[PDB]
Ligand binder design. Sequence first.
Ligand SMILES: CNC(=O)CN(Cc1ccc(-n2cncn2)cc1)C(=O)CSc1ccccc1Cl
Ligand SMILES: CNC(=O)CN(Cc1ccc(-n2cncn2)cc1)C(=O)CSc1ccccc1Cl
Ligand SMILES: CNC(=O)CN(Cc1ccc(-n2cncn2)cc1)C(=O)CSc1ccccc1Cl
Ligand SMILES: [Cl-]
Ligand SMILES: [Cl-]
Ligand SMILES: [Cl-]
Ligand SMILES: [Cl-]
Ligand SMILES: [Cl-]
Ligand SMILES: [Cl-]
Ligand SMILES: [Cl-]
Ligand SMILES: [Cl-]
Ligand SMILES: [Cl-]
Ligand SMILES: [Cl-]
Ligand SMILES: [Cl-]
Ligand SMILES: [Cl-]
Ligand SMILES: [Cl-]
Ligand SMILES: [Cl-]
Ligand SMILES: [Cl-]
Ligand SMILES: [Cl-]
Ligand SMILES: [Cl-]
Ligand SMILES: [Cl-]
Ligand SMILES: [Cl-]
Ligand SMILES: [Cl-]
Ligand SMILES: [Cl-]
Ligand SMILES: [Cl-]
Lengths: 258, 258, 258
Amino acid sequence: MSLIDPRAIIDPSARLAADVQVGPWSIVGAEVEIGEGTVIGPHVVLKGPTKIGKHNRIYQFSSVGEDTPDLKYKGEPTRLVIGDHNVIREGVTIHRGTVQDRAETTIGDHNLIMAYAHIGHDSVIGNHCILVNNTALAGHVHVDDWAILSGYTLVHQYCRIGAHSFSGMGSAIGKDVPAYVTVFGNPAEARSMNFEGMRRRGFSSEAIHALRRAYKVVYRQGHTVEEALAELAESAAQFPEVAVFRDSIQSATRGITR
Amino acid sequence: MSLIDPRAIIDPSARLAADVQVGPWSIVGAEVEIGEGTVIGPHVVLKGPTKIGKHNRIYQFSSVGEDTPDLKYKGEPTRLVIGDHNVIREGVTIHRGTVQDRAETTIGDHNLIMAYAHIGHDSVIGNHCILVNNTALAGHVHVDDWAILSGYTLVHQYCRIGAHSFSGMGSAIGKDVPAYVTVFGNPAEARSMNFEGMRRRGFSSEAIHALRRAYKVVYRQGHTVEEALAELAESAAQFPEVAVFRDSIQSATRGITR
Amino acid sequence: MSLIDPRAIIDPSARLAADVQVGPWSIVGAEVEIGEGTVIGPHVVLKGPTKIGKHNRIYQFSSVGEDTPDLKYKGEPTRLVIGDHNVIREGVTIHRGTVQDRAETTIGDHNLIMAYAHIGHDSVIGNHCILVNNTALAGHVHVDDWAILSGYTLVHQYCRIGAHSFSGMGSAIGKDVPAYVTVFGNPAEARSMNFEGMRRRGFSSEAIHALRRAYKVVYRQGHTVEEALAELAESAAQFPEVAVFRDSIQSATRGITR
Ligand SMILES: CNC(=O)CN(Cc1ccc(-n2cncn2)cc1)C(=O)CSc1ccccc1Cl
Ligand SMILES: CNC(=O)CN(Cc1ccc(-n2cncn2)cc1)C(=O)CSc1ccccc1Cl
Ligand SMILES: CNC(=O)CN(Cc1ccc(-n2cncn2)cc1)C(=O)CSc1ccccc1Cl
Ligand SMILES: [Cl-]
Ligand SMILES: [Cl-]
Ligand SMILES: [Cl-]
Ligand SMILES: [Cl-]
Ligand SMILES: [Cl-]
Ligand SMILES: [Cl-]
Ligand SMILES: [Cl-]
Ligand SMILES: [Cl-]
Ligand SMILES: [Cl-]
Ligand SMILES: [Cl-]
Ligand SMILES: [Cl-]
Ligand SMILES: [Cl-]
Ligand SMILES: [Cl-]
Ligand SMILES: [Cl-]
Ligand SMILES: [Cl-]
Ligand SMILES: [Cl-]
Ligand SMILES: [Cl-]
Ligand SMILES: [Cl-]
Ligand SMILES: [Cl-]
Ligand SMILES: [Cl-]
Ligand SMILES: [Cl-]
Ligand SMILES: [Cl-]
């Protein structure tokens, strides 16, 4: 019968587009905004200030928009922003981040965040990412587009997870993961690149070839990071996809996973 | 108090035996069937098409019968079947599986699926199994009778867990685990055989001895798998419990955990 | 707004201080006692016999006071006791323990038990401890004061975790961790001591020095545990912090994490 179930609790300051659905026993707290086409399941807790975009789905037992730990001071404004076409499965926890220092927690578009995954404060997820069951981002974690974190992947605070990268199940990531790289184990170790994912995306053969060579430059020829960046310079100018790889290594603050 | 709490939602398509109990704020969805003596706690989400048998117990915050990701086409029929005398603890997630290709998700009888454990699509659990807290079966996983997967055990798609086998806590299983074998670590490694389980089952002392010999044949004498199967043939003809072990090795598709 | 939400269920045997808050769709079961200033969120399940103290916060989807597995006999009395100023985040599970053999499950004061963490039967946690997300104590685990168990730390039954000790993310602890010791990995290995924590607690620089020397006596000088205890004796009599360390090694029942 009604799009907003009568058993849900909707705070008067929440703002919901006219077609939003909310299931029974869900709570949509103060300062939570929900855009067109989004479906909130039953037994969902939403807390704000939080903006959720269009055409999202949030499943049962999720807590989205929770308090950030250790604020600089009491009542520093925080925020969580979720874009469009995302799926947040059961039991997921997502915390807000601080606004003043531009460290909101942010999730882009077309992401899949699977059961019991955890998105810690100030983390930023791009587009078309997949965080499989029980993945946990500790805090201040940046996950660039098309990355796949397999089940039970744990990510240390401040780590960057490169575009189109891949972690194996149960991986424990302490350092940055360069774009395209595949990591496994606890502690995580680089193995290869996700050539599969490149093909599914339609990369040319020449760019794949140039990425395979780039992997060897960084990981298999005894170079220092500095020497590898200088050697990749030329290929990175020719192939935007190698520039993605090179740029991910240059902006690494915690060293790269090796 | 009524057996179906008045605050629970029971879909007009669901079919329940007359003595079934359902707690407050629980949803028994469309196309769910629940047999005699089952108790559903509070805050449970059941979705279908799902058959739950007799004398089961399903605890709070569990999502039992969720959607399979792996559909060939929109509305391909899918199903989850749970047998009798099972206990499904809090927070457990169980996905359905496809009917057409005989790949339904199936759980037999007398199983214990402990908190936050995850049973992915198309998986098949036998009888008298224990999946400890946070165990995850990614998909297409077969758990044979009496197996124990210790807490936080992660199992790769398509793996077979043999009868009476055991995994140590935090194990990450990528290959098949032969019957009776104990495995540990990330990545998992074979260590020994579950002699304790054998004695709790009543095995004769000759059969336990033959199984200890069989472990060494496969794992300690430098034999190939082909060589080991040939050498086990004789003992397997004498002892049904050694045939279990031999048969588990012969039907391995991902290699055996070593 | 009423302190006890009209949608919560409060068993007539439960005993609450007058100012206790209890959110919608929460169950305070039989034999649950709750003290002054404690706040129970929505969607919380409390079962007894369980005592919760003063100024505690228990978040959504938590099951606090659950049954102990395999009691000596049906209806052997069990209990869980939680002290004051504790925070129990979402999805946390805490089981009771047996009363007769002094094995209740007990939690002291000023503890932070983060999302989806698990406290198994007969476990004892002191004061000012942090169990990060998804930390799991299997059963009969003792956690001394100021310990920090990072996310996804798994603890085998009967282990003791010493005061001021630290585990890295994803650690799988199978033996005792001495006080102050930092451990990492699956299986866990000792790396150093938590000198940071000592500084934040205000230890004198002479006591930190004596603890650094004590670490080397146990771990870096080829001594047996017996030898090391004899050599530490003198410093332990002079510094109460080194006695903490020595006493944690002497009372180890599963060997120490090395
Ligand atoms: C189906 N493929 C796998 O399950 C491999 N995989 C990566 C992965 C997983 C799922 C997806 N998608 C789901 N909907 C769309 N995409 C994509 C890649 C794992 O993480 C395995 S571990 C694991 C897996 C599931 C639960 C618990 C655990 Cl531990
Ligand atoms: C009591 N034995 C253990 O706790 C050993 N165990 C195997 C095991 C565990 C339980 C059972 N049963 C429970 N009811 C009946 N059987 C049987 C074997 C583990 O998985 C340890 S780890 C762990 C354990 C519990 C929670 C989280 C974690 Cl991480
Ligand atoms: C901020 N520090 C860290 O996040 C480091 N940490 C220890 C730690 C963590 C939190 C706290 N507190 C929170 N409120 C007060 N204290 C203190 C120490 C981890 O366990 C990282 S792993 C992890 C972290 C969080 C979620 C999932 C995972 Cl997997
Ligand atoms: Cl909108
Ligand atoms: Cl999921
Ligand atoms: Cl956080
Ligand atoms: Cl993997
Ligand atoms: Cl790879
Ligand atoms: Cl692929
Ligand atoms: Cl792309
Ligand atoms: Cl039935
Ligand atoms: Cl679903
Ligand atoms: Cl459980
Ligand atoms: Cl699934
Ligand atoms: Cl073993
Ligand atoms: Cl009190
Ligand atoms: Cl009590
Ligand atoms: Cl006691
Ligand atoms: Cl938390
Ligand atoms: Cl327990
Ligand atoms: Cl760590
Ligand atoms: Cl350290
Ligand atoms: Cl320091
Ligand atoms: Cl102190
Ligand atoms: Cl020892």
